[PDB]
Write an enzyme that holds these catalytic residues in place. Sequence first.
Site, PDB file in Angstrom:
ATOM      1  N   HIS A 119      43.108  47.990  48.053  1.00  0.00           N
ATOM      2  CA  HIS A 119      43.578  48.039  46.598  1.00  0.00           C
ATOM      3  C   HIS A 119      42.398  47.888  45.646  1.00  0.00           C
ATOM      4  O   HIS A 119      42.087  48.596  44.688  1.00  0.00           O
ATOM      5  CB  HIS A 119      44.712  46.892  46.328  1.00  0.00           C
ATOM      6  CG  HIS A 119      45.168  46.822  45.011  1.00  0.00           C
ATOM      7  ND1 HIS A 119      46.157  47.237  44.693  1.00  0.00           N
ATOM      8  CD2 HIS A 119      44.499  46.194  43.722  1.00  0.00           C
ATOM      9  CE1 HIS A 119      46.340  47.051  43.268  1.00  0.00           C
ATOM     10  NE2 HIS A 119      45.425  46.377  42.803  1.00  0.00           N
ATOM     11  N   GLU A 120      41.493  46.728  45.894  1.00  0.00           N
ATOM     12  CA  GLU A 120      40.489  46.612  44.898  1.00  0.00           C
ATOM     13  C   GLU A 120      39.415  47.721  44.757  1.00  0.00           C
ATOM     14  O   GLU A 120      38.988  47.921  43.751  1.00  0.00           O
ATOM     15  CB  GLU A 120      39.960  45.132  45.297  1.00  0.00           C
ATOM     16  CG  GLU A 120      40.888  43.828  44.915  1.00  0.00           C
ATOM     17  CD  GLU A 120      41.295  43.660  43.570  1.00  0.00           C
ATOM     18  OE1 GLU A 120      40.708  44.192  42.966  1.00  0.00           O
ATOM     19  OE2 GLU A 120      42.479  43.077  43.434  1.00  0.00           O
ATOM     20  N   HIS A 123      40.081  50.300  42.628  1.00  0.00           N
ATOM     21  CA  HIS A 123      39.286  50.001  41.306  1.00  0.00           C
ATOM     22  C   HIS A 123      37.958  50.454  41.505  1.00  0.00           C
ATOM     23  O   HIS A 123      37.645  50.928  40.454  1.00  0.00           O
ATOM     24  CB  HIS A 123      39.898  48.628  40.975  1.00  0.00           C
ATOM     25  CG  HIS A 123      41.102  48.103  40.579  1.00  0.00           C
ATOM     26  ND1 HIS A 123      41.837  48.901  39.920  1.00  0.00           N
ATOM     27  CD2 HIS A 123      41.789  47.072  40.995  1.00  0.00           C
ATOM     28  CE1 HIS A 123      43.192  48.285  40.175  1.00  0.00           C
ATOM     29  NE2 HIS A 123      43.164  47.313  40.592  1.00  0.00           N
ATOM     30  N   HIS A 129      45.949  50.796  37.866  1.00  0.00           N
ATOM     31  CA  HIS A 129      47.369  50.326  38.657  1.00  0.00           C
ATOM     32  C   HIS A 129      48.567  51.694  38.366  1.00  0.00           C
ATOM     33  O   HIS A 129      48.379  52.477  37.492  1.00  0.00           O
ATOM     34  CB  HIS A 129      47.979  49.432  38.168  1.00  0.00           C
ATOM     35  CG  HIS A 129      47.332  47.924  38.469  1.00  0.00           C
ATOM     36  ND1 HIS A 129      47.050  46.954  37.721  1.00  0.00           N
ATOM     37  CD2 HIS A 129      46.744  47.741  39.627  1.00  0.00           C
ATOM     38  CE1 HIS A 129      46.577  45.799  38.519  1.00  0.00           C
ATOM     39  NE2 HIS A 129      46.369  46.475  39.642  1.00  0.00           N
TER      40      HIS A 129
END
Length: 166
Positions: A119-120, A123, A129
């Site tokens: 997930h990170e 980014h 998101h």
Amino acid sequence: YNVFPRTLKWSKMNLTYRIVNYTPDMTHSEVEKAFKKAFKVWSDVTPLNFTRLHDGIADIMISFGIKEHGDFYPFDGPSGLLAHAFPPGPNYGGDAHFDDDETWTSSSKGYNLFLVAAHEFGHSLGLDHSKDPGALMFPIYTYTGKSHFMLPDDDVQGIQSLYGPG
Ligand SMILES: Cc1ccc(CSc2nc3c(c(=O)[nH]2)CCC3)cc1
Ligand SMILES: Cc1ccc(CSc2nc3c(c(=O)[nH]2)CCC3)cc1
Ligand SMILES: [Ca+2]
Ligand SMILES: [Ca+2]
Ligand SMILES: [Zn+2]
Ligand SMILES: [Zn+2]
Ligand SMILES: [Zn+2]
């Protein structure tokens, strides 16, 4: 006039990362495997490639820290914030930090490091998101209990919209 332009994406496909330090919660090998798998999530569906550096400066600097840890975006002890990562760019750009007041695991206990890292890194690569609750880039952590991971279509479309397919 001038505005602050954002680097929407890395201008290069070959990126480096460095694991600067390690959580107490998992073996070195487990941590390395989790991050390797987390990067593979994205490289599997794009032209992106990731190379691990053991020393010096890499594009994506990965570290574990607690409370105030050097960027004035402090962590908050157990639960709450789990990790954060910077959008593409020089210096802190791309870097990923994990709250070492969490219990990191390779399972369902605590927080699964692979899942959070994947997930990170989304980014770090330029993804914000998702509103799709089934997406990896959804703001809320869940754990399926499954042995295999498949990147949801929403995340695939998102990352490919930046870098194209593999
Ligand atoms: C120079 C500079 C400093 C900080 C930032 C923002 S870091 C950051 N990114 C993100 C989140 C965050 O909480 N913090 C949520 C997901 C993206 C961006 C640029
Ligand atoms: C901070 C934060 C927020 C959300 C996540 C993603 S949780 C998660 N996503 C997904 C799966 C999962 O098991 N867990 C299956 C595929 C998508 C990870 C970290
Ligand atoms: Ca960086
Ligand atoms: Ca926390
Ligand atoms: Zn930080
Ligand atoms: Zn996020
Ligand atoms: Zn399996």
